[model samples]
Target: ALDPLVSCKLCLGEYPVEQMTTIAQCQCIFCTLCLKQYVELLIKEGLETAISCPDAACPKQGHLQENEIECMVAA
Candidate 1:
């Protein structure tokens, strides 16, 4: 039997583990596209704040590292 699907808090969409990125510290999961867009939008808006996991209930409240964000966005 296969595992059940997981839902992304940001877009409120469901997908399998292969389509998502799990926060290293919090284990909060969101789709890769949503996470990339989230990071791109923030950088485009000139926001200097750390990018946190979209899950409000995440225990660690982990932020995306600078390298992680860079990996998703273009120069």
Candidate 2:
């Protein structure tokens, strides 16, 4: 059986593990759907270089993982 849904910290949405995107630097988790739109929007507004954890209060202040970035770019 599949695992139960987990809550996303940023959007407050409940999603399965497969749909969740885990930040490599800080280990923060968010819904992939949310992050996809969030990143696209950020870059859309010319904030391309700013891809840190969306957790606003995250101490690491780190960016998203490289493969994930490539995944986004390839699409």
Candidate 3:
């Protein structure tokens, strides 16, 4: 069952735990769904600033554009 509150930004899929953690640097541990959706959505958005993840702690900036790529590219 999805929490509806805590979900992946990419696919919006529900994760195993509440406070999700990514194996990588980015804290946002997106579910399988979000993982797939992220790539698809980003391609269409073309560097958008408004479309952010639903998670509050895991804001788009914190999770999506948290690296040099977004800092330099997502601008």
Candidate 4:
């Protein structure tokens, strides 16, 4: 099967699903590179625990769960 491509709202670039992640909160999907980096930067700056969606206009005001963050980046 062919891997489908999805667009990242953050970067607005198209990438294969393998490089994407779906936020559990609002079902927001973004490129893993973008999402992972976003999460990483926040944690490094001590803004974690309840990081909001990278999308500024997210209607649900989605937040990344602890487990979701855990699985995205390496331990």
Candidate 5:
């Protein structure tokens, strides 16, 4: 799927994107400043289950390992 944000999925409010890895495969096309802010927010909040994407229908748990976070980059 083409990144909606880079394309036409621009929501009124800009949400943070997760881009801890190289662009060969990134979960989201994160702007650097927003990414840093998001990281800080998570750190301030104390890592827990609150880091899930705000998209309610998107799964927050049970499949994180399958994402680019672990399989592609973290490995």
Candidate 6:
């Protein structure tokens, strides 16, 4: 079995499926590194605002839930 590579809209980098995170809201997918760092920076800045899909053109404008961010970085 094989998983196809996924492209991150944020960095436009291609990575394995296991290295990507799919936003539950808009289903927008991005590399874990980009997404994790984005969220981490926000948290470090003491910003409680919702983390949205990295793609500016995201139609659904999905947001990352708190648990999602915690789990991704924890892993």
Q: What is the lDDT of candidate 2?
A: 0.69
The TM-score values for the models, in the order shown, are 0.72, 0.65, 0.34, 0.73, 0.31, 0.74
Residue 33 local lDDT, model 6? 82
Residue 21 lDDT, candidate 1, scale 0-100: 82
lDDT of 2 at 49: 63
**TM-score of structure candidate 6:** 0.74
Name the top TM-score candidate. 6
Give all candidates' CA lDDT scores: 0.74, 0.69, 0.46, 0.76, 0.35, 0.75
Lowest summed lDDT across 10 adjacent residues in model 3 is found at 64-73
Error of 4 at 26 (Å): 0.3
Tens digits of per-residue lDDT for model 1 on 42-63? 6455557677777767779887
Encode model 2's per-residue lDDT on 1-75: one tens digit a residue.
Answer: 876466677788877777786776887778877777767666455435667788788888668744555466445
**True-structure lDDT of candidate 1:** 0.74
Give the better candidate number (3 or 5) by TM-score. 3
Off by over 4 Å in 1: 1-4, 43-47
Q: Per-residue lDDT for 1-75 in model 6, tens only? A: 866554887787778777887877998778878888887666445457777777779899888777657766754
What would you estimate as the lDDT of candidate 3? Answer: 0.46
Clashing pairs in 1: none
Candidate 3 per-residue lDDT over residues 17-72, each given as its tens digit: 64443423445566634443443456345565433443555543343433432333
> RMSD of candidate 3 to the true fold?
7.8
Query: For every candidate structure, what is the RMSD over all alpha carbons to the true structure, in angstroms?
Result: 2.6, 3.8, 7.8, 3.7, 8.5, 3.6
Worst 10 residues of 5 by lDDT: 19-28
Model 4 spans > 4 angstroms off? 1-6, 45-49
lDDT of 5 at 29: 39
lDDT of 4 by residue, 1-75 (tens): 765455788888888666788877788879888888888766545554577888989998688765557556756
Higher-ranked by lDDT: 3 or 4:
4
TM-score of 5: 0.31
Model 5: lDDT of residue 59:
36
Whose TM-score is higher: candidate 2's or candidate 3's? 2
